[PDB]
Write a protein that binds this ligand. Sequence first.
Ligand SMILES: Nc1ncnc2c1ncn2[C@@H]1O[C@H](COP(=O)(O)OP(=O)(O)O)[C@@H](O)[C@H]1O
Ligand SMILES: Nc1ncnc2c1ncn2[C@@H]1O[C@H](COP(=O)(O)OP(=O)(O)O)[C@@H](O)[C@H]1O
Ligand SMILES: Nc1ncnc2c1ncn2[C@@H]1O[C@H](COP(=O)(O)OP(=O)(O)O)[C@@H](O)[C@H]1O
Ligand SMILES: Nc1ncnc2c1ncn2[C@@H]1O[C@H](COP(=O)(O)OP(=O)(O)O)[C@@H](O)[C@H]1O
Ligand SMILES: Nc1ncnc2c1ncn2[C@@H]1O[C@H](COP(=O)(O)OP(=O)(O)O)[C@@H](O)[C@H]1O
Ligand SMILES: [Mg+2]
Ligand SMILES: [Mg+2]
Ligand SMILES: [Mg+2]
Ligand SMILES: [Mg+2]
Ligand SMILES: [Mg+2]
Lengths: 372, 372, 372, 372, 372
Amino acid sequence: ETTALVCDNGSGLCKAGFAGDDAPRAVFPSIVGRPRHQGVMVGMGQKDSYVGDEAQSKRGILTLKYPIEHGIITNWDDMEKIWHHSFYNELRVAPEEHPTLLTEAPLNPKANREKMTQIMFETFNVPAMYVAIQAVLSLYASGRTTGIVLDSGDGVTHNVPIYEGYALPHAIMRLDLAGRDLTDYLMKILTERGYSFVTTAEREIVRDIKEKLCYVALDFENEMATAASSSSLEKSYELPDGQVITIGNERFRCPETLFQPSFIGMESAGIHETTYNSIMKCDIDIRKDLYANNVLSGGTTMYPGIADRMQKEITALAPSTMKIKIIAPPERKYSVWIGGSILASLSTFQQMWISKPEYDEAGPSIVHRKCF
Amino acid sequence: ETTALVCDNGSGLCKAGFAGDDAPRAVFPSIVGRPRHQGVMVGMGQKDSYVGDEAQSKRGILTLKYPIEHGIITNWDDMEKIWHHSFYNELRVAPEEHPTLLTEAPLNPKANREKMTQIMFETFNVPAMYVAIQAVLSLYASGRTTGIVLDSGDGVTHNVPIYEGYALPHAIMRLDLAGRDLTDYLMKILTERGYSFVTTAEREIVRDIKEKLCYVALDFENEMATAASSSSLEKSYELPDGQVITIGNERFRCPETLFQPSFIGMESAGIHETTYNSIMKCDIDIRKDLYANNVLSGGTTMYPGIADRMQKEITALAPSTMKIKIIAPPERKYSVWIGGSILASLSTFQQMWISKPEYDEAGPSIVHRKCF
Amino acid sequence: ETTALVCDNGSGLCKAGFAGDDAPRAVFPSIVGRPRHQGVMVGMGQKDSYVGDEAQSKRGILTLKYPIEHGIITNWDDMEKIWHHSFYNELRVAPEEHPTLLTEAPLNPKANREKMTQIMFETFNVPAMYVAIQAVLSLYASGRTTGIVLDSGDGVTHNVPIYEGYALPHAIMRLDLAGRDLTDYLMKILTERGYSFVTTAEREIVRDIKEKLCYVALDFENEMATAASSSSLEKSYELPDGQVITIGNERFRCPETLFQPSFIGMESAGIHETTYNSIMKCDIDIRKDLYANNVLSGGTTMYPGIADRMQKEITALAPSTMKIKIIAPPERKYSVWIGGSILASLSTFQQMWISKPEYDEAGPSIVHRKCF
Amino acid sequence: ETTALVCDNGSGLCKAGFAGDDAPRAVFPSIVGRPRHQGVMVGMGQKDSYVGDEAQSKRGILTLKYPIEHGIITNWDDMEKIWHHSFYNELRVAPEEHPTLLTEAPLNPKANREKMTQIMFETFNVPAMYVAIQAVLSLYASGRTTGIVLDSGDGVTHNVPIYEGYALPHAIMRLDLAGRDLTDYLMKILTERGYSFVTTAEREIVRDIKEKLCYVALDFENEMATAASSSSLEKSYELPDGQVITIGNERFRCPETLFQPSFIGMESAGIHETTYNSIMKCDIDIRKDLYANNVLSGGTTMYPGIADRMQKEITALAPSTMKIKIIAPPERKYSVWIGGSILASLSTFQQMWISKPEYDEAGPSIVHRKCF
Amino acid sequence: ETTALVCDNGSGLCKAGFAGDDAPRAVFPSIVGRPRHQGVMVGMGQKDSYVGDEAQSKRGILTLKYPIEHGIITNWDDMEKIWHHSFYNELRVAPEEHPTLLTEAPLNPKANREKMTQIMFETFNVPAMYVAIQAVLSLYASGRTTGIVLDSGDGVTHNVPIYEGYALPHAIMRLDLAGRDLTDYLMKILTERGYSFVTTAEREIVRDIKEKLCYVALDFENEMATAASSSSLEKSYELPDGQVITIGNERFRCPETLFQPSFIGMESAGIHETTYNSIMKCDIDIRKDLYANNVLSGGTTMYPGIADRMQKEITALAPSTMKIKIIAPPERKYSVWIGGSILASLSTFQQMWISKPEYDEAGPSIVHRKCF
Ligand SMILES: Nc1ncnc2c1ncn2[C@@H]1O[C@H](COP(=O)(O)OP(=O)(O)O)[C@@H](O)[C@H]1O
Ligand SMILES: Nc1ncnc2c1ncn2[C@@H]1O[C@H](COP(=O)(O)OP(=O)(O)O)[C@@H](O)[C@H]1O
Ligand SMILES: Nc1ncnc2c1ncn2[C@@H]1O[C@H](COP(=O)(O)OP(=O)(O)O)[C@@H](O)[C@H]1O
Ligand SMILES: Nc1ncnc2c1ncn2[C@@H]1O[C@H](COP(=O)(O)OP(=O)(O)O)[C@@H](O)[C@H]1O
Ligand SMILES: Nc1ncnc2c1ncn2[C@@H]1O[C@H](COP(=O)(O)OP(=O)(O)O)[C@@H](O)[C@H]1O
Ligand SMILES: [Mg+2]
Ligand SMILES: [Mg+2]
Ligand SMILES: [Mg+2]
Ligand SMILES: [Mg+2]
Ligand SMILES: [Mg+2]
C-alpha cells in the first residue's frame, strides 16, 4: 500500500524520488566534501563532512570525493552518507516504511550488489528492495519493448540489446569511458590555452564548462579545419572568481573521445563501433529491429550533436539497405529513474521484490537469484 | 450434416481447412518455438511456446523444434500444440462438432497412427476420423484413377503406384530424402562461399533461399561447366539483417541430391530410379499406364526444372517405344489437401469413417483395420 | 588321379571344397563390396573390391553387390572375382590341376551355363568340368534314389521329383521366392515398429535377424492371435552398434511368405501347393513313393517350424490314405555340396566329365549335350 | 631429395618445422603487434609490426591482431608476415628449396585455400605444396587407421570420423567454439570478482590464466556446490605487474562452455553431443569402432578433466553395451604437426604433391582437385 | 657541418652549451635585475638591466625578476635579454651560424612554444631549431630506453613514462611544486626563529640556505621527534653581512612539501603518489619495467635523502613482489642538457630539425607538428 522509492545512484549524480512520479524530486551530485584547511573561528557550526549541494556550495575549502568510480562503489561510509542524505534530508521520509528500487550497471562486481543489499537491509532497513539494470529501465521509459540501449553516464557507457522483452547478455558490452573521463580530458586539453585546473573544486568548474559549452561535431576533420581557419567556434565562459576564458576546438575535441578513445590512450573502439559490435553479436533476425531503435540515455548523451553523429557513423557501418534511427528523447538524462518509477508502479512487479524474511533466510546471496 | 475437416500434417507445413473447399485456409509451418534467452521486462506478455507463424516472426530469440521428423511424430506435446493451434486459433472451430481427415506417409510405424487416433479421440475428441495415404489423395486431386505418385515434402519422398483404384503395396517405395535434407545440404555447401548458418532460425533463412533461388538443372555436368566458365547463373539474396549473398552452382547443386543422394552420403538411388524401380516392381500390363501418368506432388517437387529432368531420366531408363509423361500441376504443393477435401466430400466415403463408438469398443487398434 | 573340386555357387552363399569330404571347407557369402566413400589416408592398403568375409567385416563403408540374382548370374566380372576368391584365396589350389563340379538351378537360361563353361575353360581353365542339378545332388546326399526335392536357397525355390533315378522334367517347378525375398519382406515389415533399414549393409543385419530369430508357425491365425494377446513370442536382438530391437509377429510373418506369396504381391501359390502340384503332375503309380520322401534342402528350409507345417499342409492336400513324410536332415544347408562330393567321387562318373578337347572341338555348346 | 616443411597455421599458434621430426621446432603465437602510442626517442630501432614472440614480449605498447579468426584468414598481409617470420626468421630456411605442407579446418571457404595456394606459389614460391585436413593428421599421429577425431584449437572445434582410412564427409561437424571464445568468456566472468581485462594485451594474460588454472569439472552442479560451500577450489595467480588475483568457480565455469555453449548465448550443443551426433550420422556397422577410438587433439582439449568428462557424457549418451574409450595422448597439443610430419615423410605421398607446373597450367583451382 | 647548440631554459637556471660536450659551458641563473634606487654619482657605466651572474653579484641594489614562472615564460623582453646573454655574452657565438635545441616542460601552453619559435627565428634567427621534452632528454642521458622520469626543477615537477622509446601522453603528470615553492616555504618558516627575509635579494640567500643545508628525512615523524628531543640536527649558516643563523627541523620541513603539498595548502598528492599514479595509469605489462627504472633529474632531486625516501614510499605503495629501483646519477642536475647534447649529435636527428624555409612557409604553427 505504501509508495516505493526509486533511487538511481549513478557515478556522478544521485536521482531519488517516489514511484509513479514523472520527474525525480532529489537530483544532487554524489560527492562527499571534507575540510582540507584549519578551523579558526569557534561558535560557527562546522561539520566534518558535507554531502550533496552543500559540498558544491562550499567546495572552495573542501576536498570532494566521489564514492562511486566507474560504476563501482569504492568508499562505503561515503556511500552511506549519500544514501542518508538522499533518504532523510532530501526525500524527508523514513526508509523503513518504503521499499526501495536501485539501479546498477551491467558487468559489475557481485560484492558491490551484495554490500548494497546488506546496507539497504541492515542500516537503512527497508521492507523490500530490488536491483535493476539501468538500460532495461531506459527501455521502459522509452515506451517500447525492443531496441539496443546505449547508456552513458559519469562512469560507465554500456550497450544492452533487448528484443521483445528478452535481453541478450552475451551482446552486452561495457566501456569505462564516460563524463568524468571527458572532464579529465578537458582538464588536460585546457592547459594548451594557459588555463590551469588541478583541484577537485576546479573539476566541477571544468565539468560545468563541458556541460554548457561542449558539442559533438558531425565531421571531426572539417570542424578542426573550420576552427583553425576562423575563430567562429570560439566561446567564452566566466569563471566564478572573475576571469573570462575562451575555448575553440576544445568544445568538440572533448566529446570526440566518446568516438575516438585513443585520445585518452585506450585500445577500445568508439561508442558507434561498440553499438555496431553489440548489434552484430546478436541473432540475425532481430538486428533490423535493433537498427531502428537505438535508444540513447544518460547525461553524457546530452551533447547537441551526438544523435546525428551516431546516425551517420552507424549508417556508415551498417548496410545501406537498413533504416537507422537514433531515439534521443529530451528527458533521457533522467530516463533510468523514469523507467524505475514505471517498473515499481507495475502490478506485475510487486511479487518480485526481495523482502526482509527472504534476506534473513538467504543472507547476502538472494540478490543474485531474484535480480539480474 | 456438419462439414468435415481436412488436416494435412506434413513434416514442415500444416495445411488445414474444410472439406469441399478448393484451397486450404490455414497453411502454417509446423514448428514450436521456445525462448532460449532470459526475460527482463515484466508486464509484457511472454508465452512459454510460440506455434506457427508467431514462431517465425519471433525466431531470433526462439529455438524452433519440428514435432515431425521424416514423417514420424517425435514430440507429442508439441504436436498437440500444433493441432490446438490448427483447430482453435487458425480454423477457429470446435473439433468436437467436425470429423477430421488426416494424412500419413506410407511405411510409417503403427504406433504413430495409433497415438494419432488416441489424441484425436481423447484430447480433441471428434465424432469421427480417418487416416489416408497422401499419394492416394494426390491421385484424387489429379482427377485420374491410375498413375504412380511421387510425393516429396519435408521429410518423406514416397512413390506409390495405383492402377484403376487398386494400389500395389509391394511396389510402394519410401526414401527419407526431402526438403529438410536439401535445406541441411544447402547450409553445408553455403560455407564454401563464407556464409555460416548454424542456428535453427538461420535454417529458415536457408530454406527461404532454397525456395526462392534453387532450381533443377536439365544436365548437371553442362550446368557445372556453365557455372565454372561464366558468372551468369549467380543470383543475389538479401539477408533479413542487410547483407547480400551471391550463389552460383549451389542453386542447382542443392536439389541434385534428389537425383544423387550420395551428395549427402546415402546409398539409395535418385527419385527417377526410385520411380522406375517402383514401376518395374508392378505387373507388366499396367506399366505403360504408369509411364504416361507420373504425378508429382508436394513442395519439394516445386523446383522449376524438375519435370523436364524427370522426363529425361525416365525416358533414358524406360524403353524408347513407350510414352513418358510427367503430370506436374501448378497446385501440386497443396494437392494432398485438395484430394482430402475431394475424398471427404464424397457420398461414398461417409460410411468409412471411424466413429467414436467403434473406437470405444475396439481401443487404439481400429485404425489398422478401417484404414490403410 | 587328382582330386575334383565341388563348388556350389548359390545366390547368397558360395560353398566350395574337395570331392570326398563330408563338409565344405570354404563357405563364404557371395558378395562384392566396393567403397562408396572417399579415401583420405595414404599408405593404408585399400583395394578396389572386397570379396567374401572381408566384405562382411568392412560392410559399413562398402556397397555390397550380389553377382547372382534369382539363380542367374548378372555381373560376370564380380562372378570372376567370386570364383578367384574361392579358388586361390580360400581353397588355395591351382584350378588347372583339378576338375571342378558346379551346380545350377533348373529352368535357368542357357546363356548362363554357356558362359559358366566359357569362364571355367578360358579363365580358370580346368582339365574337366561338369554342371549338375542341385536337387539331384540333394537326393544323392539324402542316400535315397527316389523322392521329390524342395530346394530353397537365396534366389530359387525349386521342386524336382525323381523316381528310381529318373527325373521328370515336366513336373519340375521353379518359384522365384527364397531367402533374399524373405529378407526384403522383413526389411519392409520392420518399419512397423520404427526400425529403419535401407542400406545394403543393413540388409545383412536383417538377414542375420531372420536367421537367428525367425520361425515357421504351425497355424498362422492362432499364432497371430497369440502374438496379439500376450507378448510371449517377442524376442530381442542386439544391433551391431548397441541398440536392442524387439520383434513380435514378424518372427513368423516373414517365412509365411513361403506359404503365402501374396504377402509380397505374387500370384504364385505356396511351397506346399507347389510340391503337391508337382506330385500330381507325375505318373500316378509313383505318387505314393513321392508322398513319403519329401526331401528338404537349402538354408531357407532351416527354420525350426517348417517340417511340421509342410507335413500338415501336404497331409491336408493329399488323400488321408497316403503316408506323408518330410525328410529334413540337420545337414541340409550344405546337402547340395555333399551330394556333389558324393557324385564326383563315384567311379561311374569319371567318363561323364566334359574335358578340354571336347570343349575345343564343340565350343560353348557341349554343356547342353553332356549335362542336364 | 630435399626435406619437406610442415606448417600448422592454427588460429592462435603457428607450429612449423621439418618433416620426419618428432616435435615442431618453431611454436609461436600467430599475432601481429602494431604500436598504438607515439614514438619520442630516435635512434632506437622501432619496427612498424612485431610478429610472434616479439609481439608477446612487447605487448604493453602494441595492439595485437590475429590474422586467422575461426579458422579463416581475414588479414592477408598479416598472414604473409606470419609466414615470413615462420620461414625466414624461425626456421631460417629458403622456402623455394623446400615443399611445404599446410593444414586447414574442414567446412572452410574455398577462397581461403585458393589464396593460400596463391601466396604459397607466388610470394613464398615453393617447388610443391599440399593442404591437408587437421583431423586426418591427428589420426595419423595417433597411429591408428580408424576413429573419430575431435580437434579443438583456437577458432574451430571439429569432429571428423574416419573408418579404415575412409572419411565420412556428411558426418563432419564444425563448431565455432574454441579457446579464444573460452578466453573471451573468462574475461567476461572475471569482472564478477572486480578484475577488469579489456585490452588485447590483457587478453593474453587471461589466456595464460586459462592455460594455467582452468580445468573441466566431472560434475558441474556438484563442483558448483563445492565451490559455493568452501573455498578449497580457489587458486591465486600473480599478474605481470604485481597484483595477486584469486578465482573460485571460474576455473571450471570457463571450459564448461565447451559442453554448454548457451553460456555464451549459442544455440549449438556441446562437444559430447556433437561427437555423439557425428557418430550416429555414420553407418551403423562402424559406430562401435567409433565408440572405442575417440581421439582428442588440440590445445583446447588440454584441460586436466576433459577426458573423464567426455567419457562420462558419451557413456551416458551411448547404449550401455558399448565400450567408450577417449584417446588423449600427452602430445595431442602438437599432434596435427606430428601427423603432418608422418604424412610428408611417407613414400606413397610424394606423387600427391601439387607441383609448380600443375599450378601454372591449372591456376588457383588445382587445390580443390588434388586435396580435400 | 656546424655545431648545434643546446640551451635548457629552466625556470631558475639557464644551461647553454655546444652539442657533443659532456657539461654545459654556461650555467647561469635566469634573472633580470633592475635598479630600485637613485644613482647620485655620475660617469661610470650603470646599465638599466643586469642579466645573469652580474645580477647576483649586485643584487643588494637590484630588484630581480624571473622571466619564467612555473615553466611558462611571462616576460618576453626579459627572456630575450636572457637569450642574448646566453648567446653573445656567455657562449660568445653568433646564433645565425648554429642550430639551437631548446627544452620545454610537458602540458605547457602552445603560445609559449609558438613565441619561442618566433623569437628564435626572427630575433636570434637560427638556421634550424627544435623543441624537445625535458624527460626524454633525461632518459637519453640515463643511457636506458625505458623508465618513468621525475623531472623536478624550479617551476615544474613532471612525471613522464616512456617504454621502449614510446611515451604515454595520458600518463604524463605535471605538478606546479618545485624549488621556488620550496624556497618560498623556507622563507615562510624561517620567521618562526626570528629571521626575517622579505626582499628578492634575500630570496637568493634563502635559496642558498636550502641548497646547502636542507635534506629529505627518511621518516618525517621520527625526525621531528629527534629534532624536538635534542639539538643534534641544528646547523649554522653565515649571512653575507655577518650574522650566523641556526636552523633545526626546517632542514627537513622544507623538502617535505615535495611529499606533503598540504604544507603550502595544495590539494595535490606528493611526488611518490604522483609517480605511482603515473605508473598505474600505464598499461599493465610495462609497469614492472617502470618499477625498476625510476629516473630522477633536476636540481630539486639534489637533496641527499630523496632517493631512499622515494624508494621507501614507492615500495610501500607498490606490491611487495616488485623490485623498486630509483636511478639517481650524480650528474642529474644537468641531465636534460646532457641528453640534449646526445640527441643533437645523433645522425638520425639531423632531418627532424625545423629549418627556416619550413618556418617561412608555415608560420608559427610548424612546431606543433614536427615536435611534441
Ligand atoms: N548538458 C550536458 N551536456 C553534456 N554532458 C552532461 C550534460 N548534463 C550532464 N552531463 C554529464 O552527465 C554525467 C552524469 O549523467 P547521468 O547519467 O544523468 O548521472 P550518473 O552518471 O550519475 O547516473 C555528468 O558527468 C555530466 O558531466
Ligand atoms: N517453391 C519451392 N521451391 C522449392 N522448395 C519448396 C518450394 N515450396 C516449398 N518447398 C519445400 O517443400 C517443403 C514442404 O512441402 P509440403 O509437402 O508442401 O509440406 P509438408 O512436407 O510439410 O507436407 C518445405 O521444406 C519447403 O522447403
Ligand atoms: N538358420 C537359418 N534360418 C533361416 N534361414 C537361413 C538360415 N541359415 C541360412 N538361411 C538362409 O539361407 C539362404 C542361403 O541358403 P543356401 O542354399 O545354403 O545358400 P545359397 O542360396 O547361396 O545356395 C540365405 O539367404 C539365408 O538367409
Ligand atoms: N594447457 C592448456 N590448457 C588449456 N588450454 C590450452 C592449454 N594450452 C593451450 N591451450 C589453448 O589452446 C589454443 C591453441 O591450441 P592449438 O590447437 O595448439 O593451436 P591452434 O588453435 O593455433 O592450432 C590456445 O587458444 C590456448 O588457449
Ligand atoms: N644541492 C641542491 N640542493 C637542493 N636544491 C637544489 C640544489 N641545487 C639546485 N637546487 C634547486 O634546483 C632548482 C633548479 O634546478 P634545475 O632543474 O637544474 O634548473 P631549472 O629548474 O632552471 O631547469 C633551483 O631552484 C634550486 O633551488
Ligand atoms: Mg546513470
Ligand atoms: Mg506432405
Ligand atoms: Mg543353393
Ligand atoms: Mg589446430
Ligand atoms: Mg629543468
